[PDB]
Write a protein that binds this ligand. Structure first.
Ligand SMILES: CCCCCCCCCCCCCCCCCCCC(=O)O[C@H](COC(=O)CCCCCCCCCCCCCC)COP(=O)(O)OCCN
Ligand SMILES: *[C@@H]1O[C@H](CO)[C@@H](O[C@@H]2O[C@H](CO)[C@@H](O)[C@H](O)[C@H]2NC(C)=O)[C@H](O)[C@H]1NC(C)=O
Ligand SMILES: *[C@@H]1O[C@H](CO)[C@@H](O[C@@H]2O[C@H](CO)[C@@H](O)[C@H](O)[C@H]2NC(C)=O)[C@H](O)[C@H]1NC(C)=O
Length: 173
């Protein structure tokens, strides 16, 4: 299993040009696709799990996550100098264990194939997964952990929205 996993791969050839490739699976079955350049990013449910008005709402929130994700990469480069091209991998989701009182939720980010940062969702705080210190990772963490709604919203998305989605739709699988 009872889980929703989401994968997003973002290839930046420079701060203003990104190619997205992603997908999500519910209970081990492919259910959603993310594809295309920043200029036209398509997000589709392969199975008709949400009715059109509810999907439309889900999709605008996903597009707004992408806009902010891209904005943060541009901001990091603008303050600390990223080396392009680069590939960012976001792997996130929620799982209901059979022997569990509580969902396991996660959000891990890799850059160029190596561990970069990950979310500690209960405290709604990000940590470095690199043991290597860097101005890039320090600045990225300073932005991610700022006292604004963004990290508390992400916690709600993983702990509430994702979990309720699994509880509602896992039957249809
Ligand atoms: C169950 C519903 C979904 C159904 C399944 C759909 C799957 C279709 C697509 C395939 C998978 C693609 C990946 C999707 C991931 C995004 C998920 C949404 C995230 C999101 O909405 O976050 C909002 C906060 O934004 C943020 O948290 C912004 C964060 C910005 C930074 C990103 C963190 C990574 C670090 C950046 C790298 C920097 C690198 C520098 C070198 C909170 O939700 P909401 O209120 O908007 O929506 C309302 C619902 N809660
Ligand atoms: C997103 O799609 C990719 C590509 O189909 C999935 O990765 C494959 O997963 C299968 C089954 O686990 C493996 O046999 C392949 O080796 C994987 N290929 C690659 C290139 O990684 C991935 O599991 C999907 N993720 C989600 C959350 O749906
Ligand atoms: C991510 O990986 C890419 C490709 O491996 C890196 O791009 C290289 O950057 C070096 C500078 O050290 C250039 O000499 C090469 O021309 C680039 N390779 C290409 C264009 O294929 C990029 O620097 C890496 N970035 C991070 C942040 O790890």
């Amino acid at each position: 299993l009872q889980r929703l996993h989401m994968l997003q791969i973002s290839y930046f050839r420079d701060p203003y040009h990104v190619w997205y490739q992603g997908n999500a699976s519910l209970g081990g079955h492919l259910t959603h696709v993310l594809e295309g350049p920043d200029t036209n990013t398509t997000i589709i449910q392969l199975q008709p799990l949400q009715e059109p008005e509810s999907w439309a709402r889900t999709q605008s929130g996903l597009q707004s996550y992408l806009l902010q994700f891209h904005g943060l990469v541009r901001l990091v480069h603008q303050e600390r100098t990223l080396a392009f091209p680069l590939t960012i991998r976001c792997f996130l989701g929620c799982e209901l264990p059979p022997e569990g009182s509580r969902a396991h939720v996660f959000f891990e980010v890799a850059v160029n194939g190596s561990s970069f940062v990950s979310f500690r969702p209960e405290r709604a705080l990000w940590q470095a997964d690199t043991q290597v210190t860097s101005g890039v990772v320090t600045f990225t963490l300073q932005q991610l952990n700022a006292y604004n709604r963004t990290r508390y919203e992400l916690r709600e998305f993983l702990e509430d929205t994702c979990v309720q989605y699994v509880q509602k739709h896992i039957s249809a699988e």
